[PDB]
Amino acid sequence: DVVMTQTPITLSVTIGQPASISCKSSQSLLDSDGKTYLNWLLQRPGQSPKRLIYLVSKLDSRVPDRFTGSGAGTDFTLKISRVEAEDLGIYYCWQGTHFPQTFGGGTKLEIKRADAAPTVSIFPPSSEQLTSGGASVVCFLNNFYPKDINVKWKIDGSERQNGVLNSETDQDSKDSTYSMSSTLTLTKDEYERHNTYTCEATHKTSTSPIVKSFNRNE
Amino acid sequence: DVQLRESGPDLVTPSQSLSLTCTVTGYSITSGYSWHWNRQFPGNKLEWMGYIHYSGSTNYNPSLRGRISITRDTSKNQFFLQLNSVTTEDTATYYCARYGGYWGQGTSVTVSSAKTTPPSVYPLAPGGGATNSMVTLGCLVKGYFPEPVTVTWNSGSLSGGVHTFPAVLQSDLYTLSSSVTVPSSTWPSETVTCNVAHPASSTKVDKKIVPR
Numbered sequence: 001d002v003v004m005t006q007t008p009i010t011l012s013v014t015i016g017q018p019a020s021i022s023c024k025s026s027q028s029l030l031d032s033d034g035k036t037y038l039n040w041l042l043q044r045p046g047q048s049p050k051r052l053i054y055l056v057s058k059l060d061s062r063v064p065d066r067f068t069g070s071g072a073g074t075d076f077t078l079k080i081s082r083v084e085a086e087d088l089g090i091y092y093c094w095q096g097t098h099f100p101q102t103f104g105g106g107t108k109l110e111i112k113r114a115d116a117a118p119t120v121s122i123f124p125p126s127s128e129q130l131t132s133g134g135a136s137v138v139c140f141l142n143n144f145y146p147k148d149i150n151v152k153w154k155i156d157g158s159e160r161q162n163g164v165l166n167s168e169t170d171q172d173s174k175d176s177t178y179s180m181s182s183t184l185t186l187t188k189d190e191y192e193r194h195n196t197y198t199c200e201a202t203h204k205t206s207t208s209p210i211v212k213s214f215n216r217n218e
Numbered sequence: 219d220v221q222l223r224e225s226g227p228d229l230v231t232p233s234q235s236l237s238l239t240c241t242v243t244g245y246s247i248t249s250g251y252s253w254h255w256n257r258q259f260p261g262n263k264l265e266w267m268g269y270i271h272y273s274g275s276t277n278y279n280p281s282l283r284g285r286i287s288i289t290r291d292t293s294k295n296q297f298f299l300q301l302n303s304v305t306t307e308d309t310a311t312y313y314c315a316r317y318g319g320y321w322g323q324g325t326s327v328t329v330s331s332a333k334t335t336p337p338s339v340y341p342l343a344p345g346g347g348a349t350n351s352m353v354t355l356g357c358l359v360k361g362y363f364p365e366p367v368t369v370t371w372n373s374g375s376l377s378g379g380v381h382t383f384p385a386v387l388q389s390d391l392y393t394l395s396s397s398v399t400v401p402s403s404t405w406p407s408e409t410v411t412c413n414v415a416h417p418a419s420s421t422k423v424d425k426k427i428v429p430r
Contacts, residue, residue, distance in 0.1 A: 039319075049264070051319025060319055090262055100279045101266035108262075119399075121354040123342040129358075138342055138358055140397045142381065167383040167394065181383040181395055183358075214345045 002027045004093050004104035010147065012112040013083045021078040021107050023093035028073050030097070037096035040069060040078045043106075044089040045170070052091075053078065083109070110147075113176040117205040118144035122198075122212040125191065135191035137184040139199035139212070143177040151182040152209070154198035160184060192216070219244035222314050222322035229364060230329055236301040240314030240322060241294075248272055248292050251317035255288060255299045257310035258324070265310075270297050304329045328364060332390045336421040337362035339414045342395065343427050351401040352379075355427045357412035361391045368415040369396035376400065376410075
């Protein structure tokens with residue numbers, strides 16, 4: 001079926017300055033009637049999708065003129081003359097020419113800022129949890145930028161992938177940093193079999209990983 | 219005014235059928251356009267499911283086999299989604315919509331065998347070697363269902379440096395932790411309590427963060 005591919009995946013923008021998104025269809029979107037059925041949408045965080053542009057260049061009845069639809073065939077571009085506060089979120093391109101309808105994967109819009117390293121904090125399991133025979137080793141990688149970051153778990157210096165669960169937050173509305181949790185989950189019997197537990201954070205601020213660990217016997 | 223409203227159970231059992239209802243107002247479904255159902259998955263990705271034309275005619279996305287029917291009720295100006303043989307895959311936010319850029323608010327349906335389950339709340343405190351003024355504490359909220367929960371610190375009085383990570387699934391139950399960062403002149407020099415709330419089970423647990 002017809003595929004909608006959007007570039008970039010994440011666009012870093014600054015309020016007031018312009019911005020430009022791309023969308024790419026695996027087939028020509030020109031229908032037999034002569035019209036090209038390509039829409040654009042904006043999904044603000046917390047609410048539904050919202051139509052911006054309906055036939056490649058036509059602006060929706062309720063949208064300000066700072067949005068501009070261009071293109072034809074397979075290549076289309078949404079362009080913003082000045083990014084304002086209310087434009088932040090995901091942008092989806094959509095084709096209605098071919099059955100079935102298909103949306104693009106979305107382009108997230110996020111505020112730009114100077115890079116910032118993560119403040120890595122590792123946590124041993126609580127004794128309360130250990131009474132129930134569980135052992136979760138939590139690791140916060142707090143307040144960093146940009147989004148992309150790498151965690152590595154080690155146990156007695158040996159790498160661990162099984163039983164790790166992760167979770168990135170959205171961008172902060174105040175300092176524009178991201179944060180991410182990493183959670184090795186173990187049973188008490190498993191946990192007591194080893195001493196060292198290490199959380200290792202690799203980010204584009206440094207080639208050196210930020211290491212944080214602890215030993216059960218202290 | 220073209221206005222659409224979704225309505226129906228937000229939780230269905232994996233074997234059963236997911237049935238919803240779109241109550242459209244300020245426009246007649248019989249005189250009009252195509253009337254669609256769309257869903258959005260966790261990944262943010264949107265899938266078109268199907269529609270019913272004002273004539274009563276239908277089309278469905280082949281991705282949903284023949285396990286979807288979109289019926290109608292012209293007497294109350296409504297169209298209905300019915301999705302059968304549901305799974306984890308079918309967990310999404312479901313939207314009803316009309317062809318000219320009209321979307322409903324959308325309801326989040328989850329698909330799960332899980333019973334209502336209150337969270338266990340565990341303290342997150344360091345072990346040895348805090349650097350400077352600031353130190354980060356937390357609260358692990360493990361093994362709860364369904365969503366959501368609400369985490370606060372000192373009954374909300376701590377806002378400054380507070381994250382709550384999005385929930386994640388872990389053997390049919392949700393887990394998240396909330397981080398807080400404060401100067402060490404304030405901890406353990408005075409109380410840092412986390413307050414977790416899980417409305418679905420009327421839970422309200424505080425957990426004081428003790429060192430060591």
